[PDB]
Motif scaffolding. Sequence first.
Motif, PDB file in Angstrom:
ATOM      1  N   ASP I  31      33.040  52.908  47.496  1.00  0.00           N
ATOM      2  CA  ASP I  31      33.424  54.132  48.189  1.00  0.00           C
ATOM      3  C   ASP I  31      34.901  54.379  47.914  1.00  0.00           C
ATOM      4  OD1 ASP I  31      33.559  56.339  50.089  1.00  0.00           O
ATOM      5  OD2 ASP I  31      34.173  54.920  51.634  1.00  0.00           O
ATOM      6  N   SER I  32      35.220  55.526  47.309  1.00  0.00           N
ATOM      7  CA  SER I  32      36.583  55.757  46.836  1.00  0.00           C
ATOM      8  C   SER I  32      37.568  55.933  47.978  1.00  0.00           C
ATOM      9  CB  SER I  32      36.631  56.982  45.930  1.00  0.00           C
ATOM     10  OG  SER I  32      35.723  56.836  44.858  1.00  0.00           O
ATOM     11  N   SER I  33      37.079  56.314  49.155  1.00  0.00           N
ATOM     12  CA  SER I  33      37.940  56.409  50.324  1.00  0.00           C
ATOM     13  C   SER I  33      38.364  55.041  50.811  1.00  0.00           C
ATOM     14  CB  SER I  33      37.215  57.113  51.462  1.00  0.00           C
ATOM     15  OG  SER I  33      36.433  56.158  52.147  1.00  0.00           O
ATOM     16  N   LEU I  83      41.622  45.077  44.396  1.00  0.00           N
ATOM     17  CA  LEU I  83      40.613  45.785  43.616  1.00  0.00           C
ATOM     18  C   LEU I  83      40.716  47.276  43.925  1.00  0.00           C
ATOM     19  CD1 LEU I  83      38.484  45.927  41.622  1.00  0.00           C
ATOM     20  CD2 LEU I  83      36.812  45.157  43.297  1.00  0.00           C
ATOM     21  N   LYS I  84      41.219  48.051  42.970  1.00  0.00           N
ATOM     22  CA  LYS I  84      41.587  49.442  43.173  1.00  0.00           C
ATOM     23  C   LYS I  84      40.471  50.365  42.698  1.00  0.00           C
ATOM     24  CE  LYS I  84      46.690  49.684  43.199  1.00  0.00           C
ATOM     25  NZ  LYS I  84      47.303  48.474  42.527  1.00  0.00           N
ATOM     26  N   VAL I  85      40.520  51.616  43.157  1.00  0.00           N
ATOM     27  CA  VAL I  85      39.749  52.705  42.570  1.00  0.00           C
ATOM     28  C   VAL I  85      40.724  53.717  41.989  1.00  0.00           C
ATOM     29  CG1 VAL I  85      38.140  54.596  42.938  1.00  0.00           C
ATOM     30  CG2 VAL I  85      37.743  52.381  44.028  1.00  0.00           C
ATOM     31  N   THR I 132      31.309  53.375  40.750  1.00  0.00           N
ATOM     32  CA  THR I 132      30.596  53.783  41.968  1.00  0.00           C
ATOM     33  C   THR I 132      29.650  52.696  42.480  1.00  0.00           C
ATOM     34  OG1 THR I 132      28.490  54.865  41.259  1.00  0.00           O
ATOM     35  CG2 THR I 132      30.541  56.142  40.905  1.00  0.00           C
ATOM     36  N   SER I 133      29.031  51.927  41.586  1.00  0.00           N
ATOM     37  CA  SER I 133      28.393  50.676  41.963  1.00  0.00           C
ATOM     38  C   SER I 133      28.744  49.620  40.927  1.00  0.00           C
ATOM     39  CB  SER I 133      26.869  50.809  42.070  1.00  0.00           C
ATOM     40  OG  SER I 133      26.484  51.348  43.326  1.00  0.00           O
TER      41      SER I 133
END
Lengths: 97, 168, 442, 27, 56, 137, 37, 176, 244
Positions: I31-33, I83-85, I132-133
């Motif tokens: 989840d990017s949020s 662990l970033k997005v 995303t997964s």
Amino acid sequence: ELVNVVDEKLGTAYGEKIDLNNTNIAAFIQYRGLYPTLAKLIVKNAPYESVEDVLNIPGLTERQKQILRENLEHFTVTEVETALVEGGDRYNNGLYK
Amino acid sequence: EINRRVQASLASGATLEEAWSAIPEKLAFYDYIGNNPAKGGLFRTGPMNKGDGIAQAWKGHAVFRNKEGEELFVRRMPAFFESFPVILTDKNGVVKADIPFRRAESKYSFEQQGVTVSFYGGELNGQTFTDPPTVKSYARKAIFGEIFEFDTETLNSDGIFRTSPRGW
Amino acid sequence: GFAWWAGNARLINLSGKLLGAHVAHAGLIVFWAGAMTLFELAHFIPEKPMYEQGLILIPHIATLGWGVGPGGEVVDTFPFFVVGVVHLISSAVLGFGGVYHAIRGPETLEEYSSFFGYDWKDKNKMTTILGFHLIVLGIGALLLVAKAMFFGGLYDTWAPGGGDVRVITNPTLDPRVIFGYLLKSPFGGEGWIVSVNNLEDVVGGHIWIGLICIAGGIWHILTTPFGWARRAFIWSGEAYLSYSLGALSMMGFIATCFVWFNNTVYPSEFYGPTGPEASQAQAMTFLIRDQKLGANVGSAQGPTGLGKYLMRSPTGEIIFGGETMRFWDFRGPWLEPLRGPNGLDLNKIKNDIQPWQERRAAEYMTHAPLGSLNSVGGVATEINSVNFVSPRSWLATSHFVLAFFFLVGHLWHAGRARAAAAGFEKGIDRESEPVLSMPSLD
Amino acid sequence: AQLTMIAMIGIAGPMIIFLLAVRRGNL
Amino acid sequence: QGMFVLPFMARLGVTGSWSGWSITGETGIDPGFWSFEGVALAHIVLSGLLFLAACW
Amino acid sequence: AELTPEVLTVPLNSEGKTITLTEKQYLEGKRLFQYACASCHVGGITKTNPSLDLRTETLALATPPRDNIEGLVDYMKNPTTYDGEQEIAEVHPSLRSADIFPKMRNLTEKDLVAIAGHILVEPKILGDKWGGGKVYY
Amino acid sequence: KLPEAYAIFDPLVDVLPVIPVLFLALAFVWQAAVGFR
Amino acid sequence: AIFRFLLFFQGFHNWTLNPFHMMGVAGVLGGALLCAIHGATVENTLFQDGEGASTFRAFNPTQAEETYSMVTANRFWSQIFGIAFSNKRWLHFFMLFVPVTGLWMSAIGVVGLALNLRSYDFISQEIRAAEDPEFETFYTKNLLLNEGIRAWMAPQDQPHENFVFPEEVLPRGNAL
Amino acid sequence: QTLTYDDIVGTGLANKCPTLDDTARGAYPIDSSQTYRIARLCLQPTTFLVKEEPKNKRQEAEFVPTKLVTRETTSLDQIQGELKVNSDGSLTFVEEDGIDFQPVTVQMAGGERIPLLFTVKNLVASTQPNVTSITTSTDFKGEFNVPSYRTANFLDPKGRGLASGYDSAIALPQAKEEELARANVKRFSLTKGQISLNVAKVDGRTGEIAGTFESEQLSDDDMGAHEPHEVKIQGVFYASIEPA
Ligand code: CLA
Ligand code: CLA
Ligand code: CLA
Ligand code: CLA
Ligand code: CLA
Ligand code: HEC
Ligand SMILES: CC1=C(/C=C/C(C)=C/C=C/C(C)=C/C=C/C=C(C)/C=C/C=C(C)/C=C/C2=C(C)CCCC2(C)C)C(C)(C)CCC1
Ligand SMILES: CC1=C(/C=C/C(C)=C/C=C/C(C)=C/C=C/C=C(C)/C=C/C=C(C)/C=C/C2=C(C)CCCC2(C)C)C(C)(C)CCC1
Ligand SMILES: CC1=C(/C=C/C(C)=C/C=C/C(C)=C/C=C/C=C(C)/C=C/C=C(C)/C=C/C2=C(C)CCCC2(C)C)C(C)(C)CCC1
Ligand SMILES: CCCCCCCCCCCCCCCCCC(=O)O
């Protein structure tokens, strides 16, 4: 062309001031108010591009800021020397008494 | 005797270069530990030349000074010591420079004290050196006394002091 | 035919006078036990750890639960006094019987009473005396059990909350555990019986040993030696002496290693830290200091490429770095809370080190069992100042020396018993020299 | 001092030999 | 390289050394006992036993 | 040379008042330093943290200055880190922490003055050896 | 320190532990008195 | 003071490396061996010449007869060690020879050290080590110890020389 | 249920990373949020390959097998990090701390010992865009730092070092020093390595993942004395992900 970089460093301001980017933490005991607490923060937030960067360390109280101000003249910055900052050597460089 | 002569030359208005250039190379070569018969070893065989080499030329008298222009003096190696550190003193014996072992708390490095070496007489007369690793190289030879150029190739000299026929 | 300097060999066949020597000497042992305790007590200062004060007997009493409370603090010195006085008083009684049997009593016993008299060559009688003493010994090991289970417990350095006296309600009886120790390797990480690390196993082991000694004792009263044993042994007083010297020697060497490595029945609170402990505590100490300054002790590479603070053992466990790599088998109550399944846990090291652990490490590092013969403490280059030699160094060295000499005594008396039994302990008969009737080798 | 008691105790043993040797006893 | 007996061992099937090289250039080979080293050793031991037989 | 009053004169406080100890106080200080401190501080170093020693010049630069009887007595009651920012009674002996450091229990106020005095005298007697470590043995 | 009511005996207890050594010494006085017979 | 002389000779002369000391060591340790083994042998091959358990009485300094069996002693050692003495005279001469010769040898090497004519180094080792920093032997390890001995003891042991070694020039490994 | 120290000690298991069930073929949604950390990253090498020297022009040597001589001392573990997005849906792990080096020495055929500092120090490894997964086909690729195997206090057998030690060959007082320059002047190297981590197993419930890694890096150059070898390491990894 083969040069000892530690000897080379003793030819810079590192050999006459506390270098905020290279010098082992125990040097901060040479001046009042700096060790352990500010010494900890200075080493954790290195490298610095100029000596006054240290005043922009988040969390400094105004007393802490004042101490740094008084001591800015015992500080310098030179380029980080890999040989002085690897191995945790700013926290323990193998010298005791 | 060498110092006696150089002073006598200087009193009479000779320059540093001229006082030391008048020092016969033969006298300077006596003032060198590699000719000390008590620097040998039992199984280091053959002639003295097999060790430090065949001497070719006096390089000249090395004069060390720090960044403030004070004359500094290499502490000479005594015969008992196979190895000896490099300590530079002032005319009164106060340490003013050395080559450090532990670098981290060094106060007296050549790099910090701005130690230079200047040569008078011999091969390097009038030459001055300021890059620290060259200055250190000469200070390392200065503990043996006067500094000579050696041919090490002809006899394939291994660099280790042998004793003289007086010793043997 | 013995000279004055071998004069007690004149007693071999004077069972009465020999009883007096044994009992007078028993009184000196008990005298020393008593006198020495009172000496340590008169010198004891409870504000100071026992091990800063030269105590070897008070630590044995405290280990048994007397005089101490939580953390090994001394709460009551009266139990120590009692142990000293009673031993002191009892030595007069042994003294009395001793000198009565050595000077005045009948010098031989076998005419006065067929029960108390003995012939060394009488195998039945000898195993009967052996049997009685085996029963006494079994009773004694059961007294330790009784103390632990019914009369207040024992000091338990592993108890939670700094150590305490604990009553032992589930002594280990499982023989796979108890005899498992007998079959562990004596090498590092194993430790044969020296590795026993909990009082349940200590007490259960003594139930077993008491029952075995009582059963063994009854066995030897009721039987005589089988023919294979009859033909294996020399049956003489000096031979039996030699057997027991060997057994004392074995036991002295084990006691040496016990007091040196074991911190369960020789708690470090009383005896000081072990060598491995002290050395582990140094690395702990400087891990703490350095981490407090901001160092990431898990990722810090030392001069050799191995971790400055933390490395792997040869089987992978996370262990302290530096020379103490060698002591990673060490286990102690101040250190175990940091151990996870893979060895020392980096997240516990970063988050959960407690002030008492920092104190304990500092204490043990500065009381390492190193010191000079004149009791200057620390490494051999240290200046005078600290008057300390660890009780463990004193107890290890003394008992190594005694074990060594009793092994020499074993060889002395064993070889002599063999020679005397064959009839050539006094020398070679000139008229029947065996080698002169043997053919030459070449 | 303590030098009083160890003197008193130290003399017991030899005094026993002395009494027994002057009263010609079973030494 | 002046090798004189090495090729007589190679000729009849000894090709690898306990240090893991083989004369064909393959690395990571396990020759078992009958490496160059083990052949040399067999001959030393044999020499000593025959020395003893000769004394008898 | 001898233990003159000049050497037994040390600063009482930061205001440059002085105090002249007796030879008696000094030997008592030394005795008490060996009892309660020297396991870590032998020769004026600190075995469990060698970066901080008992050299007068180091103490002078501690926050609360500790190069005087008052600073050191206070230190033995309520020790702080070298910058004064935290109390360390729980990992450093002190009267405040004498429950966990029992050797501190039987120390009187006069004993603390003697210990402090010893620490301040010794570098006048021994010079570089005091706090200099093995280089100077 | 011993209990208060035995404090009087403190200097005796400083010497007691040594007494077993004296028994060894005493055997050599005895043997001197009989001439190492 | 004599202990200091031992250590001086290690650090400055590397005297343990000197084969004249090594022959002396062999002669002194060989002497003590020969002393013990000869005494032990005589005492355990005694002839029964009295009836007492103390075997010392059964000797008379003017008796002709040997008081222990050389034949049995010789058999024992031949079977135990492979070889034995068979000549009482050679035996006792060898006991003179061994420690006397060892002491003479050590005297010679000290005469060499009078001149600093030391067995200090092996040249071939030094050439290799200078070029190859992964090369290490007990020989190089011992010279590092010597170098420590010299620098840490010379100032106080040779006070007439006024050696002043600042802390930074003292050779020291990590931490210590 | 899980094992205690006394079950593990002496076995070798302490050097082995956690494994997942071969049934763990799930998917870990991202989840990017939200922000994530890696609570534990474990790397367990199984194979050490060293690149040989062909001595000739156009052959380009091969990676050959080696024997480990330093025992079960090889695994990196307890590594943690951001662990970033990223804007484009890639994930980037940033290494913060851990037991993230081990010295290892392996032995090539012929007896040459090859020491290396097996490490992921300062690892930054990223995925493809649009994740995303995390699945049984996700790949992280990254680079890391390889400091000198020895650090600056290290003294060679003749007492020479970088931040300590002699600066010359004192046993050869009057040798020509030019020949010895490379052995007398210590140098502190700092090179990059590369790594791929291939996720092959995923526990969608717990956030644990596991799979395979391959890294390339240089071996020890003995503070400048000799040239490094090239090394390829293969092994398995485990990591647990947490909502940070
Ligand atoms: C008094 C005798 C003497 C002296 C002082 C010299 C002196 C010298 N010679 Mg000359 N030489 C001599 C005799 C002597 N020589 C003799 C007799 C010969 C004929 C063999 C020679 C042949 C000769 C040659 C060919 C050369 C020299 C050279 C030299 C020089 C170097 C010597 C050297 O490396 O020593 C090395 C010495 C040693 C390593 C010492 C040896 C130690 C011995 C082996 C110990 C023995 C111990 C013993 C076995 C123990 C047993 C005792 C016990 C157990 C029973 C030097 C000036 C060299 C030179 O430079 O010439 C230009 C040269 O090349 N010499
Ligand atoms: C349970 C232990 C034990 C027992 C009961 C015996 C009993 C005996 N031994 Mg054995 N012995 C033992 C242990 C034992 N030994 C040990 C451990 C060793 C090796 C050291 C020996 C070595 C030994 C030898 C070498 C001999 C005997 C002999 C004998 C017999 C005569 C002993 C005698 O008269 O001594 C008399 C006592 C003395 C002469 C005094 C000796 C004093 C010692 C050496 C010094 C102690 C000083 C102490 C450390 C500190 C002093 C401090 C200072 C203030 C004085 C007797 C049967 C003799 C024999 O074979 O009989 C058949 C014989 O020759 N013993
Ligand atoms: C633990 C030490 C020990 C013990 C218990 C014994 C005991 C004995 N020895 Mg041995 N002995 C020893 C050490 C010891 N010895 C040593 C170290 C040596 C070498 C010097 C000898 C040398 C030796 C020889 C040479 C002989 C003995 C003999 C004897 C026995 C007879 C002695 C006799 O007639 O006394 C006579 C002595 C006296 C009458 C003088 C007084 C002695 C008393 C007991 C002193 C005790 C004082 C004490 C404080 C009183 C407390 C009493 C209170 C509790 C009521 C006796 C059983 C003899 C023997 O075997 O007879 C066949 C013999 O010939 N011993
Ligand atoms: C193991 C040591 C030991 C041994 C084997 C002997 C053996 C003997 N003694 Mg000796 N005796 C000893 C110790 C020993 N005694 C002690 C310690 C003392 C001083 C208290 C004496 C004082 C003594 C005297 C004065 C006489 C003997 C006599 C005798 C003989 C007959 C005793 C009898 O009829 O039983 C009597 C049986 C009983 C009274 C049964 C009661 C059981 C005992 C007393 C209680 C249990 C004690 C316990 C197990 C351990 C102590 C407890 C402690 C740990 C707290 C016999 C040969 C006699 C003799 O030789 O005359 C020719 C004689 O006159 N003994
Ligand atoms: C003080 C203790 C003691 C002593 C001195 C004896 C003495 C004796 N026993 Mg008794 N025994 C004892 C206790 C003791 N026993 C106890 C407690 C029990 C009950 C379990 C027994 C049960 C018993 C039986 C059942 C028998 C004896 C027999 C004998 C005789 C022969 C012993 C023999 O040759 O063993 C020497 C040992 C062997 C030949 C083989 C075993 C060797 C061991 C296991 C090797 C271990 C070495 C290792 C390094 C030590 C470390 C520990 C180890 C476990 C790993 C002898 C008179 C025999 C006899 O004649 O009875 C009438 C017999 O059959 N004993
Ligand atoms: C180890 C167990 C110690 C004992 C016992 C004593 N001290 Fe200590 N001391 C120790 C440490 C680790 C430190 C550093 C504290 C910190 O800031 O992290 C100290 C510090 C001091 C100081 C200050 C030194 C300075 O330069 O400012 C003093 C004055 C001091 N300690 C005194 C002292 C005394 C008098 C002791 C005996 C009662 C004593 N210490 C015991 C470690 C230990
Ligand atoms: C035989 C012999 C011998 C031996 C002997 C012996 C060894 C003996 C013993 C003896 C003994 C062994 C003794 C004992 C004694 C004891 C006593 C007598 C005690 C007392 C006690 C008391 C009185 C107490 C008191 C007290 C109290 C109660 C409290 C606290 C305090 C006090 C301590 C004070 C000899 C060799 C010499 C010689 C020969 C012979
Ligand atoms: C208490 C305890 C315990 C237990 C213990 C036990 C149970 C033990 C046992 C033990 C035992 C069980 C022992 C054993 C012993 C044995 C031995 C020691 C033997 C010996 C032998 C011999 C000596 C022999 C010899 C011979 C031969 C070989 C041949 C012939 C001849 C003869 C016989 C001589 C434990 C640890 C748990 C814990 C703690 C406590
Ligand atoms: C507890 C008690 C008690 C008891 C006591 C006792 C028990 C004692 C004993 C005693 C004794 C037991 C003593 C003894 C002594 C001894 C001595 C004193 C010795 C000496 C000797 C010498 C000096 C020697 C010399 C010589 C000789 C003789 C010969 C040779 C040479 C010589 C020189 C060596 C009492 C009662 C007090 C009471 C209180 C408590
Ligand atoms: C160790 C792995 C390989 C297994 C070895 C196979 C077994 C040994 C085979 C050796 C064969 C050589 C024998 C040749 C015949 C010699 C006959 C003879 O002794 O005269």
